[PDB]
Swiss-Prot record, chains A, B, C, D, E, F, G, H, I, J:
InterPro entries: ClpP, ClpP/crotonase-like_dom_sf, ClpP/TepA, ClpP_His_AS, ClpP_Ser_AS. Cleaves peptides in various proteins in a process that requires ATP hydrolysis. Has a chymotrypsin-like activity. Plays a major role in the degradation of misfolded proteins. May play the role of a master protease which is attracted to different substrates by different specificity factors such as ClpA or ClpX. Participates in the final steps of RseA-sigma-E degradation, liberating sigma-E to induce the extracytoplasmic-stress response. Degrades antitoxin MazE. It catalyses: Hydrolysis of proteins to small peptides in the presence of ATP and magnesium. alpha-casein is the usual test substrate. In the absence of ATP, only oligopeptides shorter than five residues are hydrolyzed (such as succinyl-Leu-Tyr-|-NHMec, and Leu-Tyr-Leu-|-Tyr-Trp, in which cleavage of the -Tyr-|-Leu- and -Tyr-|-Trp bonds also occurs). GO terms for cellular component: cytosol; endopeptidase Clp complex; HslUV protease complex; membrane. Changing F111A: Little ClpA-ClpP or ClpX-ClpP complex forms. Its EC number is 3.4.21.92. This is ATP-dependent Clp protease proteolytic subunit. Fourteen ClpP subunits assemble into 2 heptameric rings which stack back to back to give a disk-like structure with a central cavity, resembling the structure of eukaryotic proteasomes. Component of the ClpAP and ClpXP complexes. Gene3D superfamilies: 2-enoyl-CoA Hydratase, Chain A, domain 1 (3.90.226.10). Keywords: Cytoplasm, Hydrolase, Protease, Serine protease, Stress response, Zymogen. GO terms for molecular function: ATP-dependent peptidase activity; ATPase binding; identical protein binding; serine-type endopeptidase activity; serine-type peptidase activity.
Length: 192, 192, 192, 192, 192, 192, 192, 192, 192, 192
């Protein structure tokens, strides 16, 4: 169930959803596995917010255990295309795709809660069929792995070699570790 | 089915849901297993209530058998971030995650019903794969266990060593026991 | 869940859906597998947009892993029938059907995000029954394969022989590769 | 999800569905398998359109892999009963029932997209029980096959003998082949 | 999905459903298997129409493969109880229960489409248990069979003996055959 | 598994299974549900024992919870056909069919253990189909019930009305009660 | 399991199973559903007995609920082909296929137990597919039904028309009734 | 369960299975679905019989509904490879594969029982995958159909066109019809 | 269920199985999917036959749709290691793994029946996991494909490039075609 | 099934299964997944062979995709405990456990076929439960990984660090590669 909220404006009362109300404040939620439908939905919200005000920052809360890579790329590409700075905030946890989108936020506007966790790992996949087909798919995933590592190094500031070594196996980083690793910028403990 | 209520205001009648109506009074319900979607929904409500009035206390009724830890951390972090004091009330029962959020409320504003039960235990998890991967996940869950114990001791006021011994196995505490254990502040028997 | 947006017009406020709001701006989403219902839905949107303004271009974001061929042909035929130029944008990935529709857009108005992937392969199918029926179905799919290759060569500009060789097995092309291959026109990195 | 459209009329704005909006323009969609519920729904639309204006032609887009025969007969009978000429348009594909309804449209108003496919085959069925019951059902389906062939010849203009030979096994016809076979009238390549 | 229609009345516009709109014109649809819920729904519509105008005829389109007998009796009894003449129209097909209700319409107002089929057969049933219980249920179904035959003869005008012989096994009758058999009155080929 | 025993017969030493060893002594076991396969096995054993000595008594242990009547009737006919008398001993349970075979033993040779349960009930059956088929099976099951009641009265000695009245529902009779009812002749407590 | 028995002969003592022991005396058991595997087993036994002694009659105990017609026909042809007369005895029950084989024994050597039940019905089948192929199967089942009735009439002695009327629906015949109908020659009640 | 038989010989006593005993007489049983495992068993028996005596005919009883084509051809080639004449006898039924093997026997040694069904139809197959793979399998199944038709014509003596026309769809042939068609040489109704 | 055979020798009567009897003649059957268990059984048989007579040739009939590559390679290595020349006969079919073993026989001893199909395709595999693991498995299968092609080229005599192109996709061959390709060197039409 | 072989001896002929016959020659087969049950058979066979001749070598054929570590360790300990040198031959493949046993053979007596693959990887496990139990099981598997690496290093002769780095992920080795690594000592291509 989604609670209903009311907005008191000069024009009059307006019924809004908890998620819809926050959207009006330039807040987007990225929850659950990253799939095509949910990812496509986030893309629409970003475009709508840009048209309303291409100068105000967009906040994207990330709490997901990761998901499809192609779906995440659409979100990543959209964030880098729209002029507004997409401020990413990590709540609960951030998996490979969640962490990738978390670090993809505007420099200096990537935050993570003190108890939030972050996990980074190489792409997962597989294929069944003839040897020729396996080689084609094997090369494709390898290219995705290389492309993902390059982007992570660009945003995190770490060397490509270091990212590859750390991404060979699941790596868990807490909020303080993410800051030192360049994955995020600061931590939000209390409201000032 | 969710019953519909009516609010008689000077402006006019307004159709509201039983849960939505209480939300307008700064009341949030945390029912069922703690997952990402439900936890994310609660986070939105807390942020919305803070914007409406960052000085009025927020009430969070807890009745759940526990759930994911990462999801609970987001709620815990949000509670410690928003200026309003989140008053946690335990109804029915409070599991490990429910108890953790219950004790995370503002000091002196944590209540529990006389017949409510509270259960605290160490984190649960598991992994299947290579030995190297098992070690990585084993260390991650251990860190979460240590982090959870530190937070419990901070809010409950007990020593870290005492929390570890009590959390080694499921521990059931009634309302009077929770008060003496520092998990809660008082009990709500009748309205004064 | 689909967030609700508000449009501030001189006539007054209007409640709109995230997808419906974008539709008002001549934007169509093609997400998920290409089936009859989803494809039929897209056809209706194209016809509605043409009636509203047969001179303004139509934007069709493509993010799908492909699907039925007959369903895609309806979309392809509708795009080539309506006077407005259908600008196809690739987000995330474009499978055989997604790539076919992506390249079917108006010349010079086919875009792809920098991290988007494109996959092209020959038609997939099969039939169980008598040998006589198998031959009929085998010939039918072969004709579809030939027809698809001819259309791909027409839009991509490549020779029919080259398309057949490249479509024999799954072929993955990135944004820069698609531009050189003639599948797309340019790339959208940042908003100018 | 069904997008919502807005109709700007002198009376005022009106919220409409993508399918409902087209229905107001005398456009009916026949998608998915031909069952009793969907077929019954189409019958209601035809009757409603006839009452609104029994002189304006009705457009029926056909994109279905076929279905029940009894359900299709209701649609076919309704089309031949209402005074308005039902213009049938084939999008994607037209199976035995889809093709039967496609050719049942008003003479000279049956269209098919250039890439649309058409398949025609004899009725499919079966029964399990006593030999006496099998004979009754076997005769019934045979009568339906004969009746279907007669109607196909009437609309297509081909000889009854030719239809029987072509319908013995699945026959696939493209848009140009359908025109020469008399199944359709013309092709819609581009809007003039 | 159920399309939405608009009714242009002097009072103003009114949003209506395709089925609801036809109901306002004294038209009832009987689709799918005859169960208790659907049958009960039809009973309510008949009562509502009678109150609105107990002098105008009621149209009941029948397209169903048959179903429960007790459910059909409620519809049959309601039709014979309300003063308005219930005009039954067969679309697609009419099974044992559908045929029974089709012939139960007012004399001279029972129509069937040219391509509609009609099937009549004896009641179907079964029971598992003690021999004493089997005899009770066996007698009950036999009584229902006799009662059904008597009603069919009364409406069809045929002799009770003839109905029993024809109902022993499934009997398929086309529109012309139904007219000669007394099951219907005339056929609706084209609107005059 | 079944243990193997050795018999020190004259001229040699042979090893036979426990069941085969008892069969050589004119002992037959009737365990489990009564079916055609097990019933034929018992019939074969009874016929074989008749050849070795058509005068020595045959023993048949009954510990079955009942089963198919047709399968059981085959044993009853064999018991009353072969010249050797069949002594039935009830061990454990004896349902309708099991009890029927228990009473089929020769007069004065029907025994029962002290702690044994005998349950007699009317035939259990069921059929689903046309009303005509229901009557055919309904009549047959009733005839079988009457036939079994007549046989029960003949062996037990109770009046036909008493058997029918007592067989309407399950009737549990202990060992001493079975003797009074006439199902068995005596009870075997200890060797004397 | 299957008990083992010892047979005394000039050579010495030989161990035989219950079924194999009775096979020496030219006794074949036909139990359970009639299928190709069990049918071939009976055919092999009949041929083996013919070679051992082509002048001694063969006894076939029939206790089955029916089965495949083709499998049963293999046994019927073998019984009529082999010179030795085949004596059929009905134990428990004899369904359509079982009854057909029961009446297929040598005239005068067909017996039935007093409580045995014989049921005869027309062939049952079914086919799912096109209208052309279903007609082939629907026409073949009728030929089998006609051929089956002709053989039944020849062995029973009743007119072909009478067999068709009685075989239209399931008909149960008791041991005495089977004698009058001609399915059996006499009834075996006791050994004399 | 297969009964055991004893073969009395001057040398001594010996035990054999029902099928093993007939194997010594150069008799092979082909029952059930045709597959590689059962086919190999038949091939092994043929090779064993050839080694024992290559100048004696081998009798093969065919009763099966057909099966895999490769498994069936493995038996057909073995029959022609071994010099001993392989006599084929049809019992019960002989489907496509069974009929092919039935007619593959040595000329003048193909027999069929009076009541036996013979069905011949084109090969059945199916494949799912890329269009290129469909053509490979589609062409192979067509070649198998042509190869089998050629062999059928050679054994039956019919023309190639006649076999193709009759084999296009299932064709049931009775024992007398099989003689005229050439599938068999004579019918064995009684032993002389 | 396998038949038993008797071998006559000076020692006395000896019982054998159909497959065991043919083993004495140096005949091995390869049927069903190739797996480790069945492969080890063939390896043991080959080693056993070598000890009895390391000079006589072994006949390995191949009829299988292929299987595991590792299991097949164990048989290939054993055949090449043992001094005796293994003669391979293809009956029914020979897939990739089956065809590889068929062509692995000694020169001039690789036979094929007149009606048999040979399929040669590249190895099939698949893996799910991290990108690093996929590359390892993807590269491993490629080595197997290359190694397999080299072995087939050596035995068939074709060039390595020719084998790679022909094995890139499924390729079916007949008995005569296999001779020209080099898989076999003769066809066993009739025993000479 | 497993074939039977006859061994010629001075006393007379004896019948043994294929596997038992090779057991007398000090040959043990290790096929399929390694488990406790199959492991005991190998352990029992190895112990039995030691008593027969504690001086002759024992041959163990390894062809399996690994298995349980505890079950495999029982074989390794038994292999090292028994005085006779155990020669291990790799046929088909040898996974982690299979490879460990392959390299555990006596020095200079470890062989592998020319076409075989050897795979080595770290132990795979997994446990779900309380965090405290995860650490216990996580540490246990780590000890096994370290213990197995030490044993493999000792047999292969390589440094412990090299084994850890190479065994960190799945590693496939061919016959010549295994010799260089140290898993095997020679390759058996042909019998000299």
């Amino acid at each position: 169930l989604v609670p209903m909220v009311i907005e008191q404006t000069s024009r009059g009362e307006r019924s809004f959803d908890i998620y819809s109300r926050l959207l009006k404040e330039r807040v987007i939620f990225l929850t659950g596995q990253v799939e095509d439908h949910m990812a496509n939905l986030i893309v629409a919200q970003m475009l709508f917010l840009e048209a309303e005000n291409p100068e105000k920052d967009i906040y994207l809360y990330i709490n997901s255990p990761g998901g499809v890579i192609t779906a995440g790329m659409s979100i990543y590409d959209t964030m880098q295309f729209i002029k507004p700075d997409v401020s990413t905030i990590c709540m609960g946890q951030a998996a490979s795709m969640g962490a990738f989108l978390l670090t993809a936020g505007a420099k200096g506007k990537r935050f993570c809660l003190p108890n939030s966790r972050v996990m980074i790992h190489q792409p997962l996949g597989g294929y069944q069929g003839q040897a020729t087909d396996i080689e084609i798919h094997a090369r494709e995933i390898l290219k995705v792995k290389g492309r993902m590592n390059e982007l992570m190094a660009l945003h995190t500031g770490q060397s490509l070699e270091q990212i590859e070594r750390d991404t060979e196996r699941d790596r868990f980083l807490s909020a303080p570790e993410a800051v030192e690793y360049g994955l995020v910028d600061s931590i939000l403990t209390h409201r000032n």
